[PDB]
Amino acid sequence: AIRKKLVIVGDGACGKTCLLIVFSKDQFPEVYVPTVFENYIADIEVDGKQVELALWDTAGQEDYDRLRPLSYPDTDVILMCFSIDSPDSLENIPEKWTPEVKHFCPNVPIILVGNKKDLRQDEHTRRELAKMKQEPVRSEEGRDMANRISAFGYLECSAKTKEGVREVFEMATRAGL
Ligand SMILES: Nc1nc2c(ncn2[C@@H]2O[C@H](COP(=O)(O)OP(=O)(O)O)[C@@H](O)[C@H]2O)c(=O)[nH]1
Ligand SMILES: [Mg+2]
């Protein structure tokens, strides 16, 4: 089996931990969500290769932010997340996440991930964003950002419905390889 280190980053509450959990446990967490997922190695088969993915969760609330840069050494692939229900989180991709990741992880491939895709057509989300003269992130905007930061790929998923979750890790593995 091939061994790869994956680091997930992006704005607070954009769904990083839930994404890791749904991929690892095949269940969206109702009941409890930790700030960061437990130390975990996932198994995935991609293109007839067995690979082990160390899943490094990160966060931003006070202490985890200082811990975050210490997590970048020897990363093989980055999941760089924003939430489709948060245009703000998308704008933070070129302003915060890409400068940080490019600094600590030169040459490391990035999968730009649009989380919470289930909220794109959500009435409540649309009404809330409408008061800001905003709307959920369009897939074309996701793609354009991926192009702009020279991501390896752009993917959308919903940890909540599981839609697209497996492909995120499959693409990340292919990049990591
Ligand atoms: N609607 C929806 N909510 C989600 C999804 N993933 C996570 N959430 C919610 O978003 C919040 C933040 O999730 P979390 O994984 O802790 O985000 P993190 O801070 O980036 O690790 C929680 O209230 C989750 O239930 C999703 O795919 N769809
Ligand atoms: Mg988290």
Q: What is the DSSP string of 28-97?
A: --SS---SSPPSEEEEEEETTEEEEEEEE----SSSHHHHTGGG-TT-SEEEEEEETT-HHHHHHIIIII
Upper half-sphere CA count for residue 120 (Cβ side, 13 Å)? 16
For a pocket test of ligand 1, which of 8, 14, 18, 90 has the largest count of ligand atoms closer than 8 A to its C-beta? Answer: 18
Closest CA to 110 of 67, 155, 73: 155
Consult the annotation and say whether 54 binds a ligand. no
Which CATH number belongs to the domain containing residue 65 in this structure?
Answer: 3.40.50.300
State this model's resolution in angstroms: 1.9
Domain that holds residue 17: 1-177
Q: How far does the centroid of ligand 1 lie from the alpha carbon of residue 82, in Å?
A: 11
Residue 93, class by beta-carbon neighbours within 10 Å (0-12 exposed, 13-18 middle, 19+ buried)?
buried
Split into its structural domains, the chain has a count of 1
Question: With contact defined as beta carbons under 8 Å apart, do 148 and 140 qualify?
Answer: no
Consult the annotation and say whether 131 binds a ligand. no
Ligand that lies nearest to the alpha carbon of residue 12, given by its number in the listed order: 1
Rounded Cα–Cα distance for residues 175 and 177 (Å): 5
Q: How far does the centroid of ligand 2 lie from the alpha carbon of residue 113, in Å?
A: 15
C-beta atoms surrounding 138 within 10 Å: 14
Upper half-sphere CA count for residue 161 (Cβ side, 13 Å)? 11
